[PDB]
Amino acid sequence: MVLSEGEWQLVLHVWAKVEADVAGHGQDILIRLFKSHPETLEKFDRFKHLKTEAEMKASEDLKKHGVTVLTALGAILKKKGHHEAELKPLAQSHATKHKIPIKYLEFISEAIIHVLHSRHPGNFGADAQGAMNKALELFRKDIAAKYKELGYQG
Ligand code: HEM
Structure with missing residues (x-):
């Protein structure tokens, strides 16, 4: 999948709000x-x-x-999809050490969207929600492709 330049702008605008209270x-x-x-x-x-x-x-x-998780995720999102090099260590530990199915990544994606609504009630509209969902779906799809590259069924 591909995001428009305007969708990435929205994602990065919302992420600046996370970065103000990462913990x-x-x-x-x-x-x-x-x-x-x-x-x-x-x-x-x-x-x-x-x-x-x-x-x-x-x-x-x-x-x-929590800080560890969001710091890694932020570095990835700032690459606007040019994130192959950042995904590799992440896929490696989650597939081979922690043994995390992709399904659990869908679950934490749902938790992120819920917490962004809960912490930013008037600042996180349908347009930003749709862009963030697309960006997280792009992340999950590419990490599932890296699991397969490593020989695992996520
Ligand atoms: C946005 C998705 C996620 C990101 C960016 C992320 C990132 C990280 C990072 C940076 C670490 C520490 C280094 C490492 O072991 O790779 C870690 C550890 C770990 N992750 Fe994740 N993670 C994500 C989702 C998940 C989910 C959904 C699970 C399980 C339900 C999970 C399970 C674990 C476990 C068990 C550890 C080791 C925890 C410990 O230190 O005791 N991860 N994760």
């Missing part, structure tokens, strides 16, 4: 993922003892991991 966004996104799809929590040995939202919000290490 807050990343913490909310992982908690939403875990509450919506508790099976994903079992993939995190360090976090699977957390059982309630209130324990999750008090974990400093969960927040740190």
Whole structure:
């Protein structure tokens, strides 16, 4: 797929808003993922003892991991689809070490969109939502192609 120059502009405009509070966004996104799809929590040995939202919000290490996730995702989005070199280390760890199906990437894409609405109620319209969905779909499609390049069925 291909985004218009105007769609990338929208994605990068919304991402500047994330970059102003990376830790807050990343913490909310992982908690939403875990509450919506508790099976994903079992993939995190360090976090699977957390059982309630209130324990999750008090974990400093969960927040740190949020920053890690969004920092990587931001570097990719800023490439406006010219991201092959950034995807390779990511596909490698997620396919071969963590053993994350592409389905779980759809789940965290849903959590990102939900948290962007929850944190930016008047700043994230249908046009920006559509552009971000396209950019995240482009990401998931290209990382599924990198899983296959590595010999895995995501
Ligand atoms: C936007 C999608 C994602 C991005 C950019 C991302 C990025 C990262 C990065 C940068 C790391 C640390 C380095 C590494 O191991 O590669 C990491 C670790 C990890 N990721 Fe992801 N990730 C994503 C989605 C997911 C999902 C949906 C899952 C599981 C449900 C997952 C499972 C894990 C696990 C288990 C680790 C190791 C955690 C630990 O340190 O204990 N990732 N991820």
